[PDB]
């Protein structure tokens, strides 16, 4: 496709790690860093699937990475989908144990 400054994008080269991939809970900032140093240049798409819908809120860093935040409004498994451009990256879904702060008297 459309070859300018590079041929195509590298999902490959991608990482994600940090809290709300290995434990998050319910109603309560999860958030993970994402290195995409070297990947390449297009438009990633992180989104959050489970037995409720999460607020995800991007946030761009002036430094060279991304930041995701989610919060979801059950405990169960959720997966945290990742592509970037056009791809999945290696790890995504990333499964993830969403508990209960605290269960109603």
């Given at each position: 496709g459309s070859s300018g400054s590079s041929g195509g994008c590298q999902p490959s080269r991608v990482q994600?790690?940090?809290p709300g991939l290995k434990e998050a809970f319910t109603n309560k900032?999860?958030?993970f860093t994402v290195v995409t140093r070297g990947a390449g240049?297009?438009?990633l798409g992180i989104t959050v699937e489970g037995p409720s819908e999460?607020?995800?809120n991007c946030r761009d860093?002036?430094?060279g990475s991304?930041?995701?935040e989610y919060i979801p409004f059950a405990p169960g498994d959720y997966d945290v989908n990742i592509t970037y451009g056009g791809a999945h990256i290696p790890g995504s879904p990333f499964r993830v144990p969403v508990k209960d702060v605290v269960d109603p008297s």
């Open positions: 994600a790690q940090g900032p999860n958030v240049i297009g438009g999460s607020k995800i860093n002036k430094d991304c930041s995701a």
